[PDB]
Amino acid sequence: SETFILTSIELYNWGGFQGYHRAEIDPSGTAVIGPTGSGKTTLVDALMTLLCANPRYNLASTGGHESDRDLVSYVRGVTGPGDGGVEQSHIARQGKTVTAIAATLERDGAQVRLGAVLWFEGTSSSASDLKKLWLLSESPEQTLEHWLSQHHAGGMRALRQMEKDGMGIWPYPSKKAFLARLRDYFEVGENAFTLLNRAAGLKQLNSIDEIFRELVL
Amino acid sequence: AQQRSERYVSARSQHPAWLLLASRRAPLVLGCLRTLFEEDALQALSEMLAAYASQATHLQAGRELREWIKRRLVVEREGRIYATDALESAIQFVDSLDSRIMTSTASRLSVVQREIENLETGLNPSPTGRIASLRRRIQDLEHELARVEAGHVDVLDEAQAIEGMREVYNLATSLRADFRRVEDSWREADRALRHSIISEHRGEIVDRLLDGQDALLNTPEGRVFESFQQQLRQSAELEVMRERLRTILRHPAVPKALNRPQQRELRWLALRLVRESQAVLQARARSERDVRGFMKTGLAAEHHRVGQLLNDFFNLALSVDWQRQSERRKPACLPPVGVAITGVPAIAFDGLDREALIHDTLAVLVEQGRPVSLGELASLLPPAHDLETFALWLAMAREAGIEVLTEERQFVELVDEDEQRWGFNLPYVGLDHEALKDIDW
Amino acid sequence: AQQRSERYVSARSQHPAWLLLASRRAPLVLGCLRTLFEEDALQALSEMLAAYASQATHLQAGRELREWIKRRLVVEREGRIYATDALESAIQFVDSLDSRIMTSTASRLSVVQREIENLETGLNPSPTGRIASLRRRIQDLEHELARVEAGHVDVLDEAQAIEGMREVYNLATSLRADFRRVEDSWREADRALRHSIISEHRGEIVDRLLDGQDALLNTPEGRVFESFQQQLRQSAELEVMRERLRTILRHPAVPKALNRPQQRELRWLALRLVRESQAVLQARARSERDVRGFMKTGLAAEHHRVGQLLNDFFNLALSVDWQRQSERRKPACLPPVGVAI
Amino acid sequence: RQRLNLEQSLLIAILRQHFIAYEQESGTGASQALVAVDELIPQLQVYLGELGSEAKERNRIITLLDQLKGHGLVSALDAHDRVIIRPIITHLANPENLQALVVWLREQVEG
Amino acid sequence: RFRLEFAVSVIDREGNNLIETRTGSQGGSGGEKEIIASYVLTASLSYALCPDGSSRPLFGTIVLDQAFSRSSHAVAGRIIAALREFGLHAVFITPNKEMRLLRHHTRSAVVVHRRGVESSLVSLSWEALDEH
Amino acid sequence: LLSYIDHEVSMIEERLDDLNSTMQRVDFQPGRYLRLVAKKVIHESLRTL
Numbered sequence A: 001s002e003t004f005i006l007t008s009i010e011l012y013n014w015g016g017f018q019g020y021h022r023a024e025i026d027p028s029g030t031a032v033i034g035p036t037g038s039g040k041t042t043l044v045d046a047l048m049t050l051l052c053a054n055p056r057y058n059l060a061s062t063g064g065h066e067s068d069r070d071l072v073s074y075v076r077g078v079t080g081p082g083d084g085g086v087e088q089s090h091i092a093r094q095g096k097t098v099t100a101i102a103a104t105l106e107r108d109g110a111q112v113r114l115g116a117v118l119w120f121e122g123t124s125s126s127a128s129d130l131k132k133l134w135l136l137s138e139s140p141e142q143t144l145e146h147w148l149s150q151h152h153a154g155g156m157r158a159l160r161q162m163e164k165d166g167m168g169i170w171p172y173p174s175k176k177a178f179l180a181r182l183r184d185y186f187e188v189g190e191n192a193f194t195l196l197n198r199a200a201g202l203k204q205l206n207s208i209d210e211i212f213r214e215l216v217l
Numbered sequence B: 001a002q003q004r005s006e007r008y009v010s011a012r013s014q015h016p017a018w019l020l021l022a023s024r025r026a027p028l029v030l031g032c033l034r035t036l037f038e039e040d041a042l043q044a045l046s047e048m049l050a051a052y053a054s055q056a057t058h059l060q061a062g063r064e065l066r067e068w069i070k071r072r073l074v075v076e077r078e079g080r081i082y083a084t085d086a087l088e089s090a091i092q093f094v095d096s097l098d099s100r101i102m103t104s105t106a107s108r109l110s111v112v113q114r115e116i117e118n119l120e121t122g123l124n125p126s127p128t129g130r131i132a133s134l135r136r137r138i139q140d141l142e143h144e145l146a147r148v149e150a151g152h153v154d155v156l157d158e159a160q161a162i163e164g165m166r167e168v169y170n171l172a173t174s175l176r177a178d179f180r181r182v183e184d185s186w187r188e189a190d191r192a193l194r195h196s197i198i199s200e201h202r203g204e205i206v207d208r209l210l211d212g213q214d215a216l217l218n219t220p221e222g223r224v225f226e227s228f229q230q231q232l233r234q235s236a237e238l239e240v241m242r243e244r245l246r247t248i249l250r251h252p253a254v255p256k257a258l259n260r261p262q263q264r265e266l267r268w269l270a271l272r273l274v275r276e277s278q279a280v281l282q283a284r285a286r287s288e289r290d291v292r293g294f295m296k297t298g299l300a301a302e303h304h305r306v307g308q309l310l311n312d313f314f315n316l317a318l319s320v321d322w323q324r325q326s327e328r329r330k331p332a333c334l335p336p337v338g339v340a341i342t343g344v345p346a347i348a349f350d351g352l353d354r355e356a357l358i359h360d361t362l363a364v365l366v367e368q369g370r371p372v373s374l375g376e377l378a379s380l381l382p383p384a385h386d387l388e389t390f391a392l393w394l395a396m397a398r399e400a401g402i403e404v405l406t407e408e409r410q411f412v413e414l415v416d417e418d419e420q421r422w423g424f425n426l427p428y429v430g431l432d433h434e435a436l437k438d439i440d441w
Numbered sequence C: 001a002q003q004r005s006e007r008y009v010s011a012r013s014q015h016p017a018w019l020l021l022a023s024r025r026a027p028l029v030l031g032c033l034r035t036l037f038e039e040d041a042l043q044a045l046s047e048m049l050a051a052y053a054s055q056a057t058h059l060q061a062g063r064e065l066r067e068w069i070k071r072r073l074v075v076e077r078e079g080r081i082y083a084t085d086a087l088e089s090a091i092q093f094v095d096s097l098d099s100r101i102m103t104s105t106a107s108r109l110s111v112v113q114r115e116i117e118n119l120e121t122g123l124n125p126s127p128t129g130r131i132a133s134l135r136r137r138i139q140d141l142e143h144e145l146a147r148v149e150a151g152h153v154d155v156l157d158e159a160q161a162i163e164g165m166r167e168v169y170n171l172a173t174s175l176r177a178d179f180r181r182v183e184d185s186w187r188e189a190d191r192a193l194r195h196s197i198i199s200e201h202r203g204e205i206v207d208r209l210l211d212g213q214d215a216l217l218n219t220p221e222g223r224v225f226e227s228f229q230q231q232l233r234q235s236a237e238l239e240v241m242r243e244r245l246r247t248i249l250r251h252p253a254v255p256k257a258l259n260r261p262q263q264r265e266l267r268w269l270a271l272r273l274v275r276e277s278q279a280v281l282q283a284r285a286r287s288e289r290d291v292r293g294f295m296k297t298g299l300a301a302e303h304h305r306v307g308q309l310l311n312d313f314f315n316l317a318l319s320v321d322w323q324r325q326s327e328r329r330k331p332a333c334l335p336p337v338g339v340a341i
Numbered sequence D: 001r002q003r004l005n006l007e008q009s010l011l012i013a014i015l016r017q018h019f020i021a022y023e024q025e026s027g028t029g030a031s032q033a034l035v036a037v038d039e040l041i042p043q044l045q046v047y048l049g050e051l052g053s054e055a056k057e058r059n060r061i062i063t064l065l066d067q068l069k070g071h072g073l074v075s076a077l078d079a080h081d082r083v084i085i086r087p088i089i090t091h092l093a094n095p096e097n098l099q100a101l102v103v104w105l106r107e108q109v110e111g
Numbered sequence E: 001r002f003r004l005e006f007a008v009s010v011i012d013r014e015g016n017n018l019i020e021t022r023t024g025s026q027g028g029s030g031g032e033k034e035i036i037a038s039y040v041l042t043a044s045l046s047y048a049l050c051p052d053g054s055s056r057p058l059f060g061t062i063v064l065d066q067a068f069s070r071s072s073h074a075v076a077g078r079i080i081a082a083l084r085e086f087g088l089h090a091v092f093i094t095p096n097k098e099m100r101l102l103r104h105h106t107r108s109a110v111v112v113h114r115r116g117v118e119s120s121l122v123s124l125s126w127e128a129l130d131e132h
Numbered sequence F: 001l002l003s004y005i006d007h008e009v010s011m012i013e014e015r016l017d018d019l020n021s022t023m024q025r026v027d028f029q030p031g032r033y034l035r036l037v038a039k040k041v042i043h044e045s046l047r048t049l
Ligand SMILES: Nc1ncnc2c1ncn2[C@@H]1O[C@H](COP(=O)(O)OP(=O)(O)OP(O)(O)=S)[C@@H](O)[C@H]1O
Pocket: A016, A034, A035, A036, A037, A038, A039, A040, A041, A042, A043, A068, A069, A070, A073, A074, A078, A079, A080, A081, E095
């Protein structure tokens, strides 16, 4: 009808997954299954990072009492608390690297794509050294591989130059303007997405007054 | 005068809504149709018709639906049933017999006088009379301002406020009556266009229409709707109107005039109207796209010729004797099409299901019709998993209120897939169908 | 949900207009009724039914007429027949199936917005808002006057003019909607009052009501109609409105907007409205006079006793054998009244 | 496969007319031609005739539908008493074959 | 917004009777907390979307993690029924604890796998999976 | 202090009514459903002011 719904999800060089991966989701409601500790929560965390203004990674594990991870660990791809030694073998990728994610919403006679690109430059772990960029496309010819080709063929300016000659593209250097534009486009309340992220894994209710006075109103 | 009688006879003969009025089962049909608009329709119609024997079910419901579709009361596009103007007109007529908001009010007279004055002023092209009218209106407004500054703020009465609210609601809600009419006009125009194209097949017309990017399906209703929506696109006055309405709603006299649904409808006029207006553009676009796709097929001449040949064959088919088996079994001449091969060249999932077990146990209980203990029930219906079943039976017994005795033991011997033996020291229960016949699960 | 189903079943069972529509001979009878309201009626019905056998005329026409009288679609008072709301509703529904004036037009939207503003202003008791709105409206009118004096006179287009004219006709013709409803409400109030008096027959209530000069038979529709006619009695605005209507009547777009009957209807709006409004008060006065006459008759107790005695007699009459001639010829006990010598 | 007689030929012609009706008012999108048996019953009764009981006519129609399904023109009935007309009939009732069969039947009637 | 106090109440369908008033989710059992929290959160989310200012939602989807970790079958059935009645679209994430109900109420499945430190994602309908 | 606060409270009450209007459609345990209510309290330093 006139309601957008998620249709597919991309992933590239993110967390445990390496190389190029993608999954399709039927709009009639789908299930995700796998043995214990196989990456199920990773996919949803990657999806959630793109919407809320403050992610709560791996919330459902504790039932809603604590957070346990951060963006940098996902980006570099740690796979355990580690052993301790000269070579930190418990880290998948070191040095300069690139990560890119994308999501696709579809509606009858419509199609909208989101996504982001992040990268480092040298062997470092400071939060400030995280080069970030968010995107929002409308045309169908915009694909993740095109973005990667543009990045490898140039730099930040090369990526920004797409808007000058292309159409249906609006890069944002700051997440705040991106969120404002998204909310204006979708015509939703100011606290909808954070509410969704909070409702993803919460299993208790201490007092409804906090929920209404902080989220709903 | 007699022409009116002839037209009435024709209307009684033709118009589908009147035929639905003349239908015997009109109440149930109207109730079902009104409830739905707020395949599966056949299910709902049969379910409603079920507990109304009084006075087949599935067959009759299907026959009625197909007859109404042939009567064009509703339309079928791909897999969905859509309504026309006649349904809404009939529904309005039926539900208007209860309560109608009176129009012969002094407030309506005042509004009519104001609109008449506005029309008379607007249609005048004289540059002098307009200036004089503007001066007179400004003078009257200044007089009113002076009187108000004198301290003469006028507040209307309770009955006056109620009448004003009712008239405003009546006039406002009437904006949504013409929506289905535009869709029906577009569909009939499309059907006429397709009939003309197939009747003509000439490829020059198809090429010219495909080349032309001008909008097809031109009816006056489309232009009127376009103008209405174009003026509706200006939100500046819409915000003021919404604010005024919400200000009005907070008055003590509101509960005395309008019920809950009317207030709810009035609160969200603007956004609902905007969305409803948007909803028709997609339909127009899809209709145009389908027409263009059909035109690009280029099979109109083929269909015309095949229809002519089929008509000739069916004309010939009336001169044969279908009462003879020998003639009916006389082979014809048609080459085999799509001939297949000659058959051969001549050389930890699943777990447990609850519903099936419950239904089978209910069937056994009703067919036996006597109290049964666990041993006999296990013997008659051997289980796949020994557990997950005793617990279910005990839970049913406890929930139904049927007493269970624990002072005596019944020994049941079971053998699993891999041979071996197990012994269950169950207590005694007695199960009957009558006690548990009226509890959902 | 199911409540609406039950309500519609009851409506099919009850509403006389639906019964007339569900009749076999609905079209011809409806045409005859429309012709008449525009003995004698029964004769005309037989005349029309004569040359329409297709598909004893006097025998069946009277039966249908009397059934519909029982169905109350037509009211018979002394010897004359009058129409009610249901017949007019059915007539409107039938004639609306051919042409319906479009209602989703921009002009109606403008009227709705302006009337919303007017009512919101009129229901505000605060003086400061009134002053501010007055000044703002004066300023807007002054700006528009300045633009017009600058030479910006605007005239509606032919399509827009036709739209406006059709909307004006649609709104104007709505004034004659609920005339008969007041009459029907007064009739049912009369019946209810008579039944209450008979069920009571207490002479104190009748004497008090006769002594009291307060007008009885009061309905909310009566109050609304009274206020409407009180405002209507101001001829100053009526003359101006009629002059504007006459001025508009002479325009090139008139033939392309309305037909001859619509022009005729718009031509004599005021006189016909005054006539119909005056007709209601005479009927109400007759109803009140007849109510007072029936009350002054003072036979309610006698009629109640006679009704009770007839009920008892009819209850007892079900225990005899009516199949025997001898019992049917057994003389009764009744003294002669008005014997002829 | 076996040859085709006149009763099956008339049924195929009726199904071709149904397919034409379906194809005329069709646009972009995946759709199928489904026809109920009860709709087909009176049209074939017009030519063949009418049997005493509805059961007899229904059995005859089911037999004919099974005979035509053996040629791959239709499919099995669903739970709602409907059949699906395969597009292969379009090539079975192409105008050349239609003309040939019309001429042959005309010669059969005339003498 | 700090000058008000909020409470929830359970009212019987027929008639209008207070049956239980609550200010939170204290003192409950395992399943009760889960069902109450899910119900109130999904209702609040449904309101918080476009129908806040009326009209139908433009972005309808909701993600549940570790679905039905503590409840029984009937509670899960009620949850699914309510979620569908609210008129949204759901994606479920569960271990292999339960799959019958998912098969009964879904159409597509994604299987993830790990072999070493990599990962593999496969998507499929149920009909293809049934044949293995 | 008077106008802004009172108007905000009134708007909040109206919005809460709108929210609890639609809750009734969805069904809780059979024969039951939920409803949200609010009460007004005034306290703290306001009186002092
Ligand atoms: N921040 C992190 N630090 C270390 N290891 C991590 C981190 N994030 C994820 N992992 C690894 O990624 C895996 C956990 O991710 P997931 O497989 O999504 O967990 P999971 O899917 O919730 O497991 P289940 O099935 O829900 S119990 C483990 O192998 C962890 O060692």
